[PDB]
Amino acid sequence: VKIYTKNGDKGQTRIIGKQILYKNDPRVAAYGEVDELNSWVGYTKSLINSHTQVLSNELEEIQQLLFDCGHDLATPADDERHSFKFKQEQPTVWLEEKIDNYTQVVPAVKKFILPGGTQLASALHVARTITRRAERQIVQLMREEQINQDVLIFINRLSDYFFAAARYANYLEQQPDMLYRNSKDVFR
Amino acid sequence: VKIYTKNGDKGQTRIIGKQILYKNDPRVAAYGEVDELNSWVGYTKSLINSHTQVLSNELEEIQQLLFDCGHDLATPADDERHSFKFKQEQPTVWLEEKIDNYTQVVPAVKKFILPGGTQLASALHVARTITRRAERQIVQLMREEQINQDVLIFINRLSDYFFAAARYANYLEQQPDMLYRNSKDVFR
Amino acid sequence: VKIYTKNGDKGQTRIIGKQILYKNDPRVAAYGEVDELNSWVGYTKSLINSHTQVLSNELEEIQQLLFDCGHDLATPADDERHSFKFKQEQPTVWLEEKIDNYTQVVPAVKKFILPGGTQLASALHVARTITRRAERQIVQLMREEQINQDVLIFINRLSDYFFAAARYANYLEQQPDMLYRNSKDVFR
Ligand SMILES: C[C@H]1O[C@@H](n2cnc3c(N)ncnc32)[C@H](O)[C@@H]1O
Ligand SMILES: C[C@H]1O[C@@H](n2cnc3c(N)ncnc32)[C@H](O)[C@@H]1O
Ligand SMILES: C[C@H]1O[C@@H](n2cnc3c(N)ncnc32)[C@H](O)[C@@H]1O
Ligand SMILES: [Mg+2]
Ligand SMILES: [Mg+2]
Ligand SMILES: [Mg+2]
Ligand code: NA
Ligand code: NA
Ligand code: NA
């Protein structure tokens, strides 16, 4: 088995189905950014400690879901031989329940917080912002091609999950969040 | 409080003031990249150790400043109800004084260095390059819309700060920098 | 020595040779993304432990090679005073030999794996995906300007190297890889 085929050496790559695209095509960029997020989630999970073990399984579950999203991003809406398989309903509800629970448990803020704290909380803020970068890429693709809009819904919700989980990670080690000193009351 | 409004689920988001933009709009991308930098700075600060404690407070101060920059990037120059609040003078002087001090104290190089060393020094090099990525985004926005040019000045200077601070972090643990083996003398 | 010249404060920067470009120009973006990768490789190397010491030297060698690639990306193909110096043959063979060896030694998969595991393996997956992001940037530049195509070949191969090395890092700590649960058999 050779994972290097060399077929990409001139700048084109195969997507799902027959088409080849330049590697900078917005479709390739979209699922490539999802893959970068997925790798960062793996890195974040590797930082789990005894205080934060309760977050481990759901990070692995998110990795599984990000593969399901990437599949659909790699699939043209008019490819007769392949169809969209990601459905947002249940995964997105699942994220919302976590967001509600973690928002309830941590100390309430009205103001923006500095993205930081523990190493794990900080990594969850990095995940938050890479998710949002991948979301931008997905919207770029959406403006040119038909996509599975359920992926967008889920990826939008996912960055709120990472915010909530980052605060929960600080709570699990009793690290206080720090406020942005010039913040207005923005959370209502 | 629900941080998930779902109003972003179709790919548009609210900026400062009345306007909504696509999430891939260059303005949204610019302050989104600043937020990614800010999160990375949080992560970097979480790596502080007893040798490097002297760097902790100024990283937190940079996080505060990055919120002030992001505010102005999110604000249209013609929005009557909101105005630019970031002024570069004092923060940028403050960075320059750190850059001068840290450049003086560490072993002099003429050649490019490998970006690495200690975990903290390496993270400061990652911060250096994410700052430069955010700067590119800010210039993309500048070419289409009027911006607070003071944010650009500060963000330019900030990546030189991260270079200087990365070298200082290696110095604080007595980790030598490594040279790029084919470098010309580039620092003059 | 002042690394801050302030000449970049209005959004333009000097490349190799006489030209100045906007900081968001695709050329500047391409070698800037290579620099971000290089910094991440430095960070990854800082995570080496006693189990993974055998990977340290080759990560440093990759950093040297990434400077050689960045040089050529910063050099216009028609700049009479500067020429391309990167040749892919030997570095790319060297990567392929590592990929072959590491593919042979680790447990065989047919299915996609979750990008994660140990902290080092996870960082090598982050390197994999940042390499692929830089590759996209390089292809963007290739579509507008003549480049040294040897850089593209090497950067393509490099992300397969990081995949193989990430799996090898997990093997070195006897951390099993996890499969994507809905994967088809994709590695043939
Ligand atoms: C909190 C604020 O963050 C901005 N916002 C919403 N989604 C994204 C994204 N994917 N990338 C960057 N910024 C975003 C909007 O301005 C929203 O109101
Ligand atoms: C050191 C060199 O790095 C380049 N340079 C300057 N600013 C940036 C940036 N934001 N992103 C990437 N590269 C940049 C220019 O080529 C400068 O001369
Ligand atoms: C494994 C699959 O990953 C995609 N692919 C190939 N190169 C890149 C890149 N630089 N960025 C993102 N995705 C890429 C193609 O779809 C290939 O078949
Ligand atoms: Mg959102
Ligand atoms: Mg600069
Ligand atoms: Mg490839
Ligand atoms: Na490959
Ligand atoms: Na939200
Ligand atoms: Na400089």
Side-chain angles (χ1 to χ4, degrees), chain A residues 2-9 11-13 15-79 82-84 86 88 91-96 98-103 105-109 111-139 141-183 185-187, chain B residues 2-9 11-13 15-79 82-84 86 88 91-96 98-103 105-109 111-139 141-183 185-187, chain C residues 2-9 11-13 15-79 82-84 86 88 91-96 98-103 105-109 111-139 141-183 185-187:
Chain A
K2 289 192 182 50
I3 59 174
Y4 57 99
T5 74
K6 315 189 188 186
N7 294 324
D9 281 353
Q12 286 175 311
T13 199
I15 63 168
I16 290 282
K18 298 286 87 195
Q19 298 187 235
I20 65 180
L21 294 176
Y22 282 108
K23 287 170 172 176
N24 72 313
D25 187 282
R27 183 182 301 281
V28 180
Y31 66 84
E33 297 291 88
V34 170
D35 188 27
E36 185 177 353
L37 174 59
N38 203 176
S39 299
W40 186 263
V41 173
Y43 182 82
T44 296
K45 187 175 172 301
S46 82
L47 309 176
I48 291 290
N49 63 29
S50 56
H51 282 77
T52 58
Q53 190 63 43
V54 290
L55 286 166
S56 183
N57 293 342
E58 65 202 59
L59 294 175
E60 190 178 289
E61 179 68 11
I62 286 164
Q63 297 197 96
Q64 301 283 1
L65 293 168
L66 289 176
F67 272 104
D68 292 340
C69 289
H71 164 98
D72 283 11
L73 293 167
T75 301
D78 61 3
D79 190 82
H82 299 94
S83 63
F84 291 155
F86 182 77
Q88 57 83 199
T92 304
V93 174
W94 177 76
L95 291 180
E96 290 166 357
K98 290 182 177 286
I99 292 160
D100 294 347
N101 180 244
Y102 298 164
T103 297
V105 202
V106 301
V109 302
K111 289 175 173 55
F112 288 126
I113 59 166
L114 304 186
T118 70
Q119 194 175 346
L120 182 72
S122 299
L124 287 160
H125 282 291
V126 173
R128 178 183 65 78
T129 63
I130 298 175
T131 300
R132 294 161 74 81
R133 175 160 51 89
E135 188 186 17
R136 299 195 284 278
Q137 295 300 92
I138 292 165
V139 172
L141 174 63
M142 180 189 90
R143 293 172 69 180
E144 295 185 28
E145 303 297 338
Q146 299 165 330
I147 65 159
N148 180 359
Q149 297 285 333
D150 281 21
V151 171
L152 179 55
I153 289 163
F154 176 76
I155 292 291
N156 182 32
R157 204 75 69 261
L158 185 61
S159 70
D160 286 351
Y161 165 84
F162 287 127
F163 180 79
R167 296 204 69 214
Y168 187 54
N170 275 337
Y171 160 96
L172 288 169
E173 294 190 48
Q174 301 186 7
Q175 164 67 66
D177 281 309
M178 298 300 117
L179 311 175
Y180 168 37
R181 65 190 174 208
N182 305 136
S183 192
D185 293 347
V186 294
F187 297 127
Chain B
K2 289 192 182 50
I3 59 174
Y4 57 99
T5 74
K6 315 189 188 186
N7 294 324
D9 281 353
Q12 286 175 311
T13 199
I15 63 168
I16 290 282
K18 298 286 87 195
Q19 298 187 235
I20 65 180
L21 294 176
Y22 282 108
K23 287 170 172 176
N24 72 313
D25 187 282
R27 183 182 301 281
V28 180
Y31 66 84
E33 297 291 88
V34 170
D35 188 27
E36 185 177 353
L37 174 59
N38 203 176
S39 299
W40 186 263
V41 173
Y43 182 82
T44 296
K45 187 175 172 301
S46 82
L47 309 176
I48 291 290
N49 63 29
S50 56
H51 282 77
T52 58
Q53 190 63 43
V54 290
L55 286 166
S56 183
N57 293 342
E58 65 202 59
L59 294 175
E60 190 178 289
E61 179 68 11
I62 286 164
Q63 297 197 96
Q64 301 283 1
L65 293 168
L66 289 176
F67 272 104
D68 292 340
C69 289
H71 164 98
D72 283 11
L73 293 167
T75 301
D78 61 3
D79 190 82
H82 299 94
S83 63
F84 291 155
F86 182 77
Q88 57 83 199
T92 304
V93 174
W94 177 76
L95 291 180
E96 290 166 357
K98 290 182 177 286
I99 292 160
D100 294 347
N101 180 244
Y102 298 164
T103 297
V105 202
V106 301
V109 302
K111 289 175 173 55
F112 288 126
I113 59 166
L114 304 186
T118 70
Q119 194 175 346
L120 182 72
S122 299
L124 287 160
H125 282 291
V126 173
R128 178 183 65 78
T129 63
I130 298 175
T131 300
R132 294 161 74 81
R133 175 160 51 89
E135 188 186 17
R136 299 195 284 278
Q137 295 300 92
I138 292 165
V139 172
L141 174 63
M142 180 189 90
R143 293 172 69 180
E144 295 185 28
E145 303 297 338
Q146 299 165 330
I147 65 159
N148 180 359
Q149 297 286 333
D150 281 21
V151 171
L152 179 55
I153 289 163
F154 176 76
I155 292 291
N156 182 32
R157 204 75 69 261
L158 185 61
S159 70
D160 286 351
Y161 165 84
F162 287 127
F163 180 79
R167 296 204 69 214
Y168 187 54
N170 275 337
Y171 160 96
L172 288 169
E173 294 190 48
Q174 301 186 7
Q175 164 67 66
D177 281 309
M178 298 300 117
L179 311 175
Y180 168 37
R181 65 190 174 208
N182 305 136
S183 192
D185 293 347
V186 294
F187 297 127
Chain C
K2 289 192 182 50
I3 59 174
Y4 57 99
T5 74
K6 315 189 188 186
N7 294 324
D9 281 353
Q12 286 175 311
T13 199
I15 63 168
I16 290 282
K18 298 286 87 195
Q19 298 187 235
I20 65 180
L21 294 176
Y22 282 108
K23 287 170 172 176
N24 72 313
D25 187 282
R27 183 182 301 281
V28 180
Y31 66 84
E33 297 291 88
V34 170
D35 188 27
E36 185 177 353
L37 174 59
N38 203 176
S39 299
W40 186 263
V41 173
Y43 182 82
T44 296
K45 187 175 172 301
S46 82
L47 309 176
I48 291 290
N49 63 29
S50 56
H51 282 77
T52 58
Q53 190 63 43
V54 290
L55 286 166
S56 183
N57 293 342
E58 65 202 59
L59 294 175
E60 190 178 289
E61 179 68 11
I62 286 164
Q63 297 197 96
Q64 301 283 1
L65 293 168
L66 290 176
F67 272 104
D68 292 340
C69 289
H71 164 98
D72 283 11
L73 293 167
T75 301
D78 61 3
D79 190 82
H82 299 94
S83 63
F84 291 155
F86 182 77
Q88 57 83 199
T92 304
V93 174
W94 177 76
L95 291 180
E96 290 166 357
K98 290 182 177 286
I99 292 160
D100 294 347
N101 180 244
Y102 298 164
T103 297
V105 202
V106 301
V109 302
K111 289 175 173 55
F112 288 126
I113 59 166
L114 304 186
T118 70
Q119 194 175 346
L120 182 72
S122 299
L124 287 160
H125 282 291
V126 173
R128 178 183 65 78
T129 63
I130 298 175
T131 300
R132 294 161 74 81
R133 175 160 51 89
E135 188 186 17
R136 299 195 284 278
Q137 295 300 92
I138 292 165
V139 172
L141 174 63
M142 180 189 90
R143 293 172 69 180
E144 295 185 28
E145 303 297 338
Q146 299 165 330
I147 65 159
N148 180 359
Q149 297 285 333
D150 281 21
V151 171
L152 179 55
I153 289 163
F154 176 76
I155 292 291
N156 182 32
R157 204 75 69 261
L158 185 61
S159 70
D160 286 351
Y161 165 84
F162 287 127
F163 180 79
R167 296 204 69 214
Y168 187 54
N170 275 337
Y171 160 96
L172 288 169
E173 294 190 48
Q174 301 186 7
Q175 164 67 66
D177 281 309
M178 298 300 117
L179 311 175
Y180 168 37
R181 65 190 174 208
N182 305 136
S183 192
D185 293 347
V186 294
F187 297 127

Short mmCIF file of all heavy atoms in Angstrom, two decimals, chain A residues 13-15 23 28-29 31-32, chain C residues 112 131-133 135-136 156, ligand 3, unseen atoms left out:
data_model
loop_
_atom_site.label_atom_id
_atom_site.label_comp_id
_atom_site.label_asym_id
_atom_site.label_seq_id
_atom_site.Cartn_x
_atom_site.Cartn_y
_atom_site.Cartn_z
N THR A 13 -6.79 17.12 -7.66
CA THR A 13 -7.12 16.01 -6.79
C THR A 13 -8.53 15.54 -7.12
O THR A 13 -9.39 16.26 -7.57
CB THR A 13 -6.98 16.42 -5.30
OG1 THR A 13 -6.88 15.25 -4.46
CG2 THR A 13 -8.06 17.36 -4.83
N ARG A 14 -8.79 14.29 -6.82
CA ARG A 14 -10.11 13.67 -7.00
C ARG A 14 -10.99 13.94 -5.81
O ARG A 14 -10.52 13.89 -4.60
CB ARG A 14 -9.90 12.16 -7.06
CG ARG A 14 -9.86 11.65 -8.41
CD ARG A 14 -11.25 11.84 -9.07
NE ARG A 14 -12.28 10.89 -8.68
N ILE A 15 -12.24 14.25 -6.10
CA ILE A 15 -13.27 14.38 -5.02
C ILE A 15 -14.10 13.10 -5.03
O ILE A 15 -13.73 12.12 -5.70
CB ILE A 15 -14.07 15.66 -5.15
CG1 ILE A 15 -14.90 15.74 -6.46
CG2 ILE A 15 -13.13 16.89 -5.01
CD1 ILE A 15 -15.89 16.84 -6.45
N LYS A 23 -6.48 21.92 -6.11
CA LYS A 23 -6.43 21.78 -4.64
C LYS A 23 -6.91 23.03 -3.95
O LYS A 23 -7.32 22.92 -2.76
CB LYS A 23 -5.07 21.34 -4.15
CG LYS A 23 -4.86 19.82 -4.51
CD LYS A 23 -3.44 19.39 -4.26
CE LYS A 23 -3.28 17.86 -4.42
NZ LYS A 23 -1.93 17.39 -4.29
N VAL A 28 -12.55 21.71 -2.06
CA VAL A 28 -11.40 21.07 -1.43
C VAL A 28 -10.96 21.81 -0.21
O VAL A 28 -10.59 21.20 0.84
CB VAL A 28 -10.24 20.87 -2.47
CG1 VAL A 28 -9.02 20.22 -1.84
CG2 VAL A 28 -10.72 20.10 -3.69
N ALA A 29 -10.97 23.11 -0.27
CA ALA A 29 -10.67 23.92 0.90
C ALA A 29 -11.66 23.66 2.03
O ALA A 29 -11.25 23.63 3.23
CB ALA A 29 -10.64 25.37 0.55
N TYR A 31 -13.62 20.88 2.82
CA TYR A 31 -13.41 19.65 3.58
C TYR A 31 -11.98 19.55 4.07
O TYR A 31 -11.75 18.88 5.12
CB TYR A 31 -13.94 18.41 2.84
CG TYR A 31 -13.26 18.00 1.58
CD1 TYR A 31 -12.12 17.22 1.62
CD2 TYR A 31 -13.84 18.27 0.33
CE1 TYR A 31 -11.50 16.79 0.42
CE2 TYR A 31 -13.21 17.84 -0.87
CZ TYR A 31 -12.08 17.11 -0.81
OH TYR A 31 -11.47 16.69 -2.01
N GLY A 32 -11.03 20.24 3.47
CA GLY A 32 -9.70 20.28 4.05
C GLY A 32 -9.69 21.02 5.39
O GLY A 32 -8.99 20.55 6.34
N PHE C 112 -10.30 4.88 7.02
CA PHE C 112 -9.81 6.11 7.60
C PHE C 112 -9.68 5.94 9.11
O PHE C 112 -10.51 5.27 9.80
CB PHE C 112 -10.76 7.25 7.33
CG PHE C 112 -10.77 7.73 5.91
CD1 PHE C 112 -11.97 7.80 5.18
CD2 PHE C 112 -9.62 8.19 5.30
CE1 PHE C 112 -11.99 8.32 3.86
CE2 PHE C 112 -9.62 8.70 4.00
CZ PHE C 112 -10.81 8.76 3.29
N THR C 131 0.10 21.30 6.38
CA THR C 131 0.81 21.12 5.12
C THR C 131 -0.14 21.19 3.96
O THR C 131 0.16 21.86 2.93
CB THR C 131 1.54 19.76 5.11
OG1 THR C 131 2.49 19.68 6.17
CG2 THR C 131 2.28 19.56 3.82
N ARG C 132 -1.28 20.54 4.09
CA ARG C 132 -2.28 20.51 3.01
C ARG C 132 -2.88 21.88 2.79
O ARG C 132 -3.14 22.26 1.61
CB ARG C 132 -3.30 19.41 3.30
CG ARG C 132 -2.65 18.04 3.23
CD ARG C 132 -3.39 16.93 3.92
NE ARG C 132 -4.58 16.50 3.19
CZ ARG C 132 -4.51 15.66 2.14
NH1 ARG C 132 -3.35 15.19 1.72
NH2 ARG C 132 -5.64 15.27 1.58
N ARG C 133 -3.06 22.66 3.84
CA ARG C 133 -3.50 24.07 3.70
C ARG C 133 -2.44 24.89 2.95
O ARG C 133 -2.79 25.67 2.02
CB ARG C 133 -3.84 24.63 5.06
CG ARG C 133 -4.19 26.12 5.00
CD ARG C 133 -5.00 26.56 6.22
NE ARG C 133 -4.46 26.20 7.52
CZ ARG C 133 -3.60 26.92 8.24
NH1 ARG C 133 -3.00 28.00 7.69
NH2 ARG C 133 -3.35 26.55 9.49
N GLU C 135 -0.29 23.71 0.88
CA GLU C 135 -0.35 23.22 -0.51
C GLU C 135 -1.45 23.90 -1.28
O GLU C 135 -1.23 24.27 -2.47
CB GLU C 135 -0.51 21.70 -0.48
CG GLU C 135 -0.40 21.09 -1.85
CD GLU C 135 -0.68 19.63 -1.92
OE1 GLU C 135 -1.29 19.04 -0.98
OE2 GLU C 135 -0.29 19.03 -2.98
N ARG C 136 -2.62 24.09 -0.69
CA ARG C 136 -3.69 24.79 -1.40
C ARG C 136 -3.24 26.19 -1.82
O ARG C 136 -3.55 26.66 -2.94
CB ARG C 136 -4.97 24.86 -0.58
CG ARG C 136 -5.55 23.53 -0.24
CD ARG C 136 -6.97 23.58 0.24
NE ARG C 136 -7.05 24.04 1.57
CZ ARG C 136 -6.87 23.33 2.72
NH1 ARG C 136 -6.52 21.97 2.74
NH2 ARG C 136 -7.03 24.05 3.84
N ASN C 156 3.29 18.18 -1.53
CA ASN C 156 2.30 17.10 -1.62
C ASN C 156 2.78 15.88 -0.85
O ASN C 156 2.08 15.33 0.05
CB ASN C 156 2.04 16.81 -3.10
CG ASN C 156 1.00 15.75 -3.27
OD1 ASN C 156 0.09 15.66 -2.42
ND2 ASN C 156 1.05 14.98 -4.38
C1 LIG D 3 -7.66 12.39 0.33
C2 LIG D 3 -8.30 13.38 -0.56
O1 LIG D 3 -7.98 14.57 0.15
C3 LIG D 3 -8.16 15.60 -0.84
N1 LIG D 3 -6.93 16.43 -0.93
C4 LIG D 3 -5.77 16.24 -1.61
N2 LIG D 3 -4.90 17.25 -1.37
C5 LIG D 3 -5.52 18.07 -0.51
C6 LIG D 3 -5.16 19.33 0.10
N3 LIG D 3 -3.91 19.84 -0.11
N4 LIG D 3 -6.10 19.94 0.88
C7 LIG D 3 -7.27 19.33 1.13
N5 LIG D 3 -7.70 18.18 0.59
C8 LIG D 3 -6.85 17.56 -0.26
C9 LIG D 3 -8.55 14.85 -2.12
O2 LIG D 3 -9.99 14.67 -2.05
C10 LIG D 3 -7.84 13.51 -1.99
O3 LIG D 3 -8.42 12.48 -2.79
#
